[PDB]
Each structure stands twice: as structure tokens, then as C-alpha cells.
Amino acid sequence: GSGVPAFLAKLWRLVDDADTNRLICWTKDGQSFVIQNQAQFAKELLPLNYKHNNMASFIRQLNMYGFHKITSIDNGGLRFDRDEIEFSHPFFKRNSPFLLDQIKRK
């Protein structure tokens, strides 16, 4: 809503409009966003939009912008771990027409 690219503008319209949730929803109140599903979270939301399907491509792209998933651990033992792909960005929340303009490919 202020010279924001379409890629990001779509996310705001993707994590809402009540049409995905299960594949992607907000985490705690409304700050970051998680994507429990991976497969199903690919051949249904990426097409009819970017055209290109695949999935690891949409992720290796999240890094090109500047994202960091909170599921690296690489050392634990408790249950958890079940495709919990979490995403965090100190510049992506609800009403905030000033956290996007500062997001572009490195």
C-alpha cells in the first residue's frame, strides 16, 4: 500500500483471506508466521501466482531476501521436530507499511 513490490504484498494477502491457515498461519498473536505443511504447502499456493511450482526454490529464495527459520537446532532429543518450518523477520508483522520498503534481494 505504498510502493510495496508484489512478491511481499502477496504474502500479506496470502497469510490471511482465510484460504490457507493449515498450510500457513501466524504464530503467537500476529508477529512471525509458521508453515507446518511443506508438500501441500507448494502445489496449491505457489501456482496460479508465480507460475513456477517446485518448493525448495521458494525457500532458497527466502534467504536471498534476508529471512532466518528458527528450526536449525541440530542438537536435541525431546519430541518436537515434525516439519516445523518456522520463519522470523524483524520487519514483517501486521499493520506496518514501513517494514517492507526495506526488503530487497541482497
Which residues are CB-contacts of 81 (< 8 A; sequence separation ≥ 6)?
73
CB 58 within 8 A of CB 39: no
Q: Domain ranges in the chain?
A: 1-106
Experimental method: NMR
Out of 3.30.1360.40, 3.90.1150.10, 1.10.10.10, 3.40.50.12240, the CATH code matching 1-106 is 1.10.10.10
